[PDB]
Nucleic acid binder design. Structure first.
Ligand SMILES: CCCCCCCCO[C@@H]1O[C@H](CO)[C@@H](O)[C@H](O)[C@H]1O
Ligand SMILES: [Mg+2]
Lengths: 403, 538
RNA sequence: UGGCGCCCGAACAGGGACUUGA
């Protein structure tokens, strides 16, 4: 039998409007949805279904075939209770300590489990049409949809049975699926890790489960600490830029002081005037430098609170990001190095993958991009089977001074 | 024989009970005759005792009102929020338009939901078909007609059918005779489901006066836009004019609407005569000259490539033409939106490009090739030096006079041998007056009293004062993140006169370095200028 | 009486930058 699913009390299913899609994406969606309907995975619905979740088409990594990407973010929010409390998937704290972490895709196995009859209504999506020529094609899921956070919650009972022989045969390999992927971490040589991943793929194929950003190395992940300029000659402009940077950083590191550095900017001086740092000023600068290299002390992950990711466009293809739950409490600060939209999409996907590997939870992204440009072009470079919750903000001019 | 859509009331709710409107003497006879006619047609049935509901009906036709029932019924998901654009229609050799007589009345209504549509007159009738004006009638009719057309659409891939509210746009690349045969086949198929359509000598020929457009066999346009040539202009007249020439802007190029819309700022009465500004009069004359000659659009050709060319016409105004062959453009348009209080030409061009991209994807499902009046070097500089993830798709430079460029750039490092200006501004919230001033490493000072000003305005005034009082090269040090961000955005035009003065003075300056220092940290000259402008405010 | 496109106005919420007082 199916697993009954109920939305949060007093809350109604998603009614998110479908973003316009291109002709090729619409054709790909039409063909794949016709195939799915023939296979019974989805069914056509009438107008009596007020719920809708936007559906996009993407091309997965190293693949030319199109893939459907239903944006179940609203449905995920509305099933939060169900899929987090009563069928939650524990996150292994040792996945981030593994030399290699490969990311398999196992969402095709969800289509073997029927969806709750009373919940299929909310898993409703529309394929748009060009120029509103014809009404959008409305579909509805008859099986556990990909991208819904309750699909892994319902399928984990089967997944544990599938993986039990594998895990017993080698208990040193950490497996963890978040929504549709299967993060497999091990401390083996990349050749041996690939061999064991092939063995796991054969194991999944034996148990019916199918499987085709992909290989991760959380062992070689380091934070991007704040670095002060290292100059032999200091100008008034340089010293006051340093003082501003340290004053901002003091909101993060209580031990940062600017007293002796600010004591150098005593009078009204030219920005190009060269000021030789005093003994006290040099010592305090050294102390600030030593305080800054180490990570902040007292910042701990709170599973109750949502993760927030801020990204700054540093220019020249370089991006800096910070992951935090409270302001000035960065859990992780890093840098992404390579088209601004493509680079931002790649940065967002990498940051989300790191967040999944570390805390098993995607963050909320404050994207330094105009909202229309992102909603227009993000699907042109997206390759993940999941979609993180994002908002669009205007990066302060002085916050781009993370490097 | 059309399969009905299962509909139900909202959870924990029952059909409305609304008394009849005040009409029982004159329109009563017409309503009774209409009800009897519908009952004979079978679309209306009589149920008196077992239908404890009612709706407010008021007529001649019978415009039954379902305002209460609309909010008592489970919501639907309408998809045709917009309307098809003629530019998006495919150029078909032969086109026929079929109107569906009695569109809703041919679609039955759910048996369980029939009672809730009680129809009582001073008798108790109930709808057997989709009621007019009901919230669920449009979606249900659209779904039923899609289901009906699916067997025909699949069996006739060549025939393209666009369904509007009650109109069938049937296009085919077949010869006139074959197209007529297919149209008769479609009419018979619809009649098999009870949807009656006109015959050969009942069909409407082109042009098709549809939704403000004039659809011709091989071109499209709008109905003639006869603007009112009057002397006085009320806010109602200005709104009507703006709407009329906004409709024309999609085909007529060069249409400007900024001064006319600006005339609608602060207006309260719908009849207040407006003193049409000289700029507004000139813009209206330009629009009249544009509208003097007819302009027609062409239909979409998927075999050709979709080109979009944008032109800058000043005052933050952009016009674009989307075409596939030169001098024959599918549709035109304008982008005059001012996103944010401050902007420059490059950001506005990026916003216009994004708007055109979304518009084209909506109409044609594909982004167009962009022909922009901006040099590749200018765009490279902007988007490399800009803090946003701005990006425009494949575009080509067009050497038109009004080229898009950046009128000034801020130095990345302090200017050697220039003068440093430490600018600050303090505003008294209570009195609303403040001060702005500057101090210089050379030893100069100046404080200019302000009035009816805020802290941000005082900071901007201080920066403007420093720019005025400095040579061609100036280092300006400010403690205001607000002004720093505004200036670093490199705006070209602004909604604030002070910011426009700052912009023009920056354009005058050959080199301008703008530094930021935290306030109240005792940083050299910042504290001095704060003490200067803090006497009357702090 | 309802939807769509545009414009004005208001209240909400939040995402930020500042002034003063306690
Ligand atoms: C684009 C999808 C709909 C196109 C067909 C619209 C119906 C045809 O247009 C019709 O033209 C007539 C005069 O010719 C007018 O009297 C009607 O009001 C109008 O509906
Ligand atoms: Mg100040």
């Amino acid at each position: 039998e199916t697993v009954p699913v109920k939305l949060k009390p007093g809350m109604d299913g998603p009614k998110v409007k479908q973003w316009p899609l291109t002709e090729e994406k619409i054709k790909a969606l039409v063909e794949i949805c016709t195939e799915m309907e023939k296979e019974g995975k989805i069914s056509k619905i009438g107008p009596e279904n007020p719920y809708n979740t936007p559906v996009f088409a993407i091309k997965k990594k190293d693949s030319t075939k199109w893939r459907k990407l239903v944006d179940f973010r609203e449905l995920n929010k509305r099933t939060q209770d169900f899929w987090e409390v009563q069928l939650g998937i524990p996150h292994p704290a040792g996945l981030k300590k593994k030399k290699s972490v490969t990311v398999l895709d196992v969402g095709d196995a969800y289509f073997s489990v029927p969806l709750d009859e009373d919940f299929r209504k909310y898993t409703a999506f529309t394929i748009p049409s060009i120029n509103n020529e014809t009404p959008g094609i409305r579909y509805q899921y008859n099986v556990l949809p990909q991208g819904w956070k309750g699909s892994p919650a319902i399928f984990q009972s089967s997944m544990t049975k599938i993986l039990e022989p594998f895990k017993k045969q080698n208990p040193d390999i950490v497996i963890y699926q978040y929504m549709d992927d299967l993060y497999v971490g091990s401390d083996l040589e990349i050749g041996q890790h690939r061999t064991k991943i092939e063995e796991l793929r054969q194991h999944l194929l034996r148990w019916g489960l199918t499987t085709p950003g992909y290989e991760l190395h959380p062992d070689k992940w380091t934070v991007q600490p704040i670095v002060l300029p290292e100059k032999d000659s200091w100008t008034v402009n340089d010293i006051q830029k340093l003082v501003g940077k340290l004053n901002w950083a003091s909101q993060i590191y209580p031990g940062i002081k600017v007293r002796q550095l600010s004591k150098l900017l005593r009078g009204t001086k030219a920005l190009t005037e060269v000021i030789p740092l005093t003994e006290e000023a040099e010592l305090e600068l050294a102390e600030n430098r030593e305080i800054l290299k180490e990570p902040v002390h007292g910042v701990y992950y709170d599973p109750s609170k949502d993760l927030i990711a801020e990204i700054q466009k540093q220019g020249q293809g370089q991006w800096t990001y910070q992951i935090y739950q409270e302001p000035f409490k960065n859990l992780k600060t890093g840098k992404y190095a390579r088209n601004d939209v493509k680079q931002l999409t790649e940065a967002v996907q990498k940051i989300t993958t790191e967040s999944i590997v570390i805390w098993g939870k995607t963050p909320k992204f404050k994207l330094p991009i105009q909202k229309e440009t992102w909603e227009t072009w993000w699907t042109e470079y997206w390759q993940a089977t999941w979609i993180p919750e994002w908002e669009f903000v205007n990066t302060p001019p002085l916050v781009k001074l993370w490097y | 024989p059309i399969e009905t859509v299962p509909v139900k009331l909202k959870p924990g709710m029952d059909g409305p009970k609304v008394k009849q409107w005040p009409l029982t003497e004159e329109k009563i006879k017409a309503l009774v005759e209409i009800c009897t006619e519908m009952e004979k047609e079978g679309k209306i049935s009589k149920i008196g005792p077992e239908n404890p509901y009612n709706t407010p009906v008021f007529a001649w036709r019978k415009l039954v009102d379902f305002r209460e029932l609309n909010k008592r019924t489970q919501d639907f998901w309408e998809v045709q929020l917009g309307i098809p654009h003629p530019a998006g229609l495919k150029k078909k050799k032969s086109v026929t338009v079929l109107d569906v007589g009695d569109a809703y009345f041919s679609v039955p209504l759910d048996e369980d939901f029939r009672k809730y549509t009680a129809f009582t007159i001073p008798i108790r009738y109930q709808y057997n078909v989709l009621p007019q004006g009901w919230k669920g009638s449009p979606a249900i009719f659209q779904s039923s007609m899609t289901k009906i057309l699916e067997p025909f659409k699949k069996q006739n891939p060549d025939i393209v059918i666009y369904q509007y509210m009650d109109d069938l746009y049937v296009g085919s690349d077949l010869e006139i005779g074959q197209h007529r045969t297919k149209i008769e086949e479609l009419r018979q198929h619809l009649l098999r489901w009870g949807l009656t359509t006109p015959d050969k000598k009942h069909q409407k020929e082109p042009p098709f006066l549809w939704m403000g457009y004039e659809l011709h066999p091989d071109k499209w346009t709008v109905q003639p836009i006869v603007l009112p040539e009057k002397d006085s202009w009320t806010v109602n007249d200005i709104c009507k004019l703006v709407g009329k020439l906004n409709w024309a802007s999609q085909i007529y190029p060069g249409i400007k609407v900024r001064q006319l819309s600006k005339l609608l700022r602060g207006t309260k009465a719908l009849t207040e005569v407006i003193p049409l500004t000289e700029e507004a009069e000139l813009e209206l004359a330009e629009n009249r000259e544009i509208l003097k000659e007819p302009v027609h659009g062409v239909y979409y050709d998927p075999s050709k490539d979709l080109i979009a060319e944008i032109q800058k016409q000043g005052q933050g105004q952009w016009t674009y033409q989307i075409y596939q062959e030169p001098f024959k453009n599918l549709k035109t348009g304008k982008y005059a939106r001012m996103r944010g209080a401050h902007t420059n030409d490059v950001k506005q061009l990026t916003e216009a490009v994004q708007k055109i991209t979304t518009e084209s994807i909506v109409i044609w499902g594909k982004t167009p090739k962009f022909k922009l009046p901006i040099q590749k070097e200018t765009w490279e500089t902007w988007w490399t030096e800009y803090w946003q993830a701005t990006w425009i798709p494949e575009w080509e430079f067009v050497n038109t006079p009004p080229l898009v460029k950046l009128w000034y750039q801020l130095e990345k490092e302090p200017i050697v041998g220039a003068e440093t200006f430490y600018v600050d501004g303090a505003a008294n919230r209570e009195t609303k007056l403040g001060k702005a001033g500057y101090v210089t490493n050379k030893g100069r000072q100046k404080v200019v009293p302000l009035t009816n000003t805020t802290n941000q305005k005082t900071q901007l005034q201080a920066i403007y004062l420093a720019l005025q009082d400095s040579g061609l090269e100036v280092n300006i040090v400010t403690d205001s993140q607000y002004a720093l961000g505004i200036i670093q955005a490199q705006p070209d035009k602004s909604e604030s006169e002070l910011v426009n003065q700052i912009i023009e003075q920056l354009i005058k300056k050959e080199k301008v370095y703008l530094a930021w220092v935290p306030a109240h940290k005792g940083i050299g000259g910042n504290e001095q200028v704060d003490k200067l402008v803090s006497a009357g405010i702090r």
